[PDB]
Ligand binder design. Structure first.
Ligand SMILES: *[C@@H]1O[C@H](CO)[C@@H](O)[C@H](O)[C@H]1NC(C)=O
Length: 713
């Protein structure tokens, strides 16, 4: 409805209303209408309103840093940040991004990403988000937006909603049932809203046959009325289709204003015309401006002294510490047989694979615009969510420096030639093989991949490369840099493969991060944020070629499908090895949670009680092994069986504890009312069912160490 007084949004609204009263229609139309594709200096720009000292609003990509900048940090993709399971690193990433954005004189950063959530492993842009889980992605969304906006920068929660594949993204209709729409996909956007996100970007796709940027139900009823979003909705780039319907459905901002060619200017003069011809009421436009100006006042951008736009400025500072930390702590150790890792003092190391060295990807090459290539070391996927590297630390260069410092001889085979890799690996103590898979936004086809991936195999003949190295060496370590799940069964069937390092997407700090882990300066502590199956056929969704995706799987995506269908994955959601072991004890559940619908008045996030704590689950974690390591403890909740069909397990908590040998620590999971709720379609309300909730705590979604119950009368 409207934000409550005495809150940041409430005060922003008071300011916004006073500013609105000083404006005429042209002022207002200029505020809501982008100047045109490449019409201003930024990715998006609106028209200034000097009467209220409102600048031309400057909007820039993206979720991992400042796009087109030559003096900015390339932060890790969101998927790597979520792979840390570290709320502190996640918030810091947001803060550091915020700092660079403001320092570059940009008002709005186009991120973080809650949509796509990532139901299909082949999804081209899943890596921009925070994994497959709505709870984790939601927590990550909230932490990142707190971080960004604490600096005084506007964040943009995108893409709203159901943009789960790149193929035909501008035409396909996503048609899930109501409960699925709310309880799975909308969930993380509620976290974003509750975090006071300034803006939300509507998606390219249709939702139940209606384009997302024209959908009254999702934009007005769900986002604005049910989630109580007080900010503004912008379109993805040329995702607007009508002048009048888009406006009346709840669209607030036409971005960038035209199509690539300067056509399809649906607002601007056309909006002026639609208001004058009484097709769009002035009240609607007045609401657009209030939301936009409120976001400006909320972030304090009205105050004198905001830096001017300049993406040539070196705004990096020491922010690389975050990239280093996340690239490092987001690595998932998948296999460590015979404890080959960490490496001690081997006489010789073979380094094999084109992905070991600097290539056109790391170099910001003319052959790799928008990072549309997997050439040499990989740090992120491609598209609007990619940025320029200020530098790039290749795995090889970092491995060579560390190994040479201890007398270890390094032999490099820097291509993906199987015979060269064999020659390099022959007679060496260990062989480290580098493989990749890449994907991105659906306007670039890279090596026959239209955005989404064609398959879940390693690129550049990675499987055959590993097989050749295994023919020549007993002690193979496989390092994988990837936008998502790869079927590892061919690699795992080779007895010579002793270690598998799921390194993820490390950006500029690739090599340093890997060495930290490989040599055991730190223990790996990342855990998977998606399921790695034994077969491509174990996944229950595919990239759809037709005009419709019925989302027939409903609530059962990724690990929820694997649990429901009784399928054993190779590596489950929340799985990660360490150089040490941890044990869990002393499970306690404190709860005052009461059943029924949420009852609080709608504020940002929904009814005011939904994000409030109703319960607390606690476990002790001790490092029982030989070395220092951080453990990610996970809480999974099973709803009463009397409640409507729900996945058997749902992530509803996580904690990360660094523990030296013999150290014990407390993991505390705070449970919000919504964490015990399901969406009831008939009443359009979040409801806590009565009964006994299963409480499961452990090291992964399958490695449950302790169980208890939470009882709701
Ligand atoms: C942009 O910033 C760079 C680096 O700080 C500086 O050299 C240049 O003069 C600036 N450009 C403008 C137009 O102020």
């Amino acid at each position: 409805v409207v934000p409550p007084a005495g809150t940041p949004w409430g005060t922003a609204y008071d300011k916004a209303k006073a500013a609105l009263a000083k404006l005429n229609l042209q002022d207002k139309v200029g505020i809501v209408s982008g100047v045109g594709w490449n019409g201003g200096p930024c990715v998006g720009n609106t028209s200034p309103a000097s009467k209220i000292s409102y600048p031309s609003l400057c909007l820039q990509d993206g979720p991992l840093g400042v796009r087109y900048s030559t003096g900015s940090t390339a932060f890790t993709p969101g998927v790597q940040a979520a792979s840390t399971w570290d709320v502190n690193l996640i918030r810091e990433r947001g803060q550091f991004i915020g700092e660079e954005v403001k320092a570059s004189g940009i008002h709005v950063i186009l991120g973080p990403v809650a949509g796509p959530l990532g139901k299909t492993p082949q999804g081209g842009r899943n890596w921009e988000g925070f994994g497959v889980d709505p709870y984790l992605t939601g927590i990550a969304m909230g932490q990142t937006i707190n971080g960004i906006q604490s600096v005084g920068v506007q964040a943009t929660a995108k893409h709203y909603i159901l943009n789960e594949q790149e193929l035909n993204r501008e035409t396909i209709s996503s048609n899930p049932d109501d409960r699925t729409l709310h309880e799975l996909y909308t969930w993380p956007f509620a976290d974003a809203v509750q975090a006071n996100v300034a803006s939300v970007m509507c998606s390219y796709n249709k939702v139940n046959t209606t384009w997302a940027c024209e959908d009254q139900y999702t934009l007005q009823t769900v986002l604005k009325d049910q989630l109580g979003f007080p900010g503004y909705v912008m379109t993805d780039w040329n995702a607007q289709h009508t002048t009048v319907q888009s406006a009346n459905s709840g669209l607030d901002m036409s971005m960038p204003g035209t199509d690539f060619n300067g056509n399809n200017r649906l607002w601007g003069p056309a909006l002026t015309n639609a208001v004058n011809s009484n097709q769009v009421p002035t009240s609607r436009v007045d609401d657009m401006v209030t939301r936009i100006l409120a976001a400006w006042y909320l972030t304090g951008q009205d105050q004198a002294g905001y830096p001017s736009f300049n993406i040539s400025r070196n705004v990096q500072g020491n922010h690389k510490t975050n990239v280093r930390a996340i690239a490092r702590d987001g690595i998932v150790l998948l296999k460590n047989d015979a404890n080959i890792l960490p490496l001690k003092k081997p006489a010789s190391i073979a380094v094999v694979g084109s992905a070991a060295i600097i290539g056109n990807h790391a170099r910001n090459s003319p052959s790799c615009n928008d990072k549309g290539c997997d050439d040499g070391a990989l740090g992120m996927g491609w598209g609007s969510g990619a940025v320029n590297y200020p530098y790039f630390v290749a795995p090889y260069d970092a491995i060579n420096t560390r190994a040479s410092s201890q007398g270890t001889q390094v032999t490099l085979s820097n291509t993906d030639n199987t015979s060269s890799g064999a020659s390099a690996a022959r007679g060496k103590d260990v062989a480290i093989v580098f493989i990749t898979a890449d994907s991105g936004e659906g306007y670039i086809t890279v090596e026959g991949n239209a955005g989404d991936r064609n398959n879940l195999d390693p690129w550049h003949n990675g499987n055959a490369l590993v097989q050749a190295v295994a023919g020549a060496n007993s002690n193979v370590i496989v390092v994988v840099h990837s936008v998502g799940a790869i079927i590892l069964e061919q690699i795992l069937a080779l007895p010579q493969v002793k270690a598998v390092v799921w390194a993820g997407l490390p950006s500029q700090e690739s090599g340093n991060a890997l060495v930290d882990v490989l040599w055991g300066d730190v223990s790996p502590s990342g855990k998977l944020v998606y399921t790695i199956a034994k077969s491509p056929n174990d996944y229950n969704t595919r990239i759809v070629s037709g005009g419709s995706d019925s989302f027939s799987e409903g609530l059962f995506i990724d690990y929820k499908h694997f649990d429901d269908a009784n399928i054993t994955p190779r590596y489950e959601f929340g799985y990660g090895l360490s150089y040490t072991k941890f044990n869990y004890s002393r499970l306690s559940v404190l709860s005052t949670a009461k059943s029924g619908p949420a009852t609080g008045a709608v504020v940002p996030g929904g009814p005011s009680d939904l994000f409030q704590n109703v319960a607390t689950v606690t476990v002790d974690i001790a490092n029982s092994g030989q070395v220092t390591g951080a453990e990610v403890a996970q809480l999974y909740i099973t709803y009463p069986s009397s409640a409507p069909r729900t996945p058997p397990k749902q992530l509803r908590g996580f904690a990360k504890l660094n523990l030296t040998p013999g150290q014990s620590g407390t993991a505390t999971f705070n449970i919000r009312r919504r964490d015990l709720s399901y969406w009831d379609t008939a009443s359009q309300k979040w409801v806590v069912p009565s009964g006994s909730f299963g409480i499961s705590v452990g090291a992964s979604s399958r490695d449950i160490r302790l169980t208890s119950t939470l009882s709701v009368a």
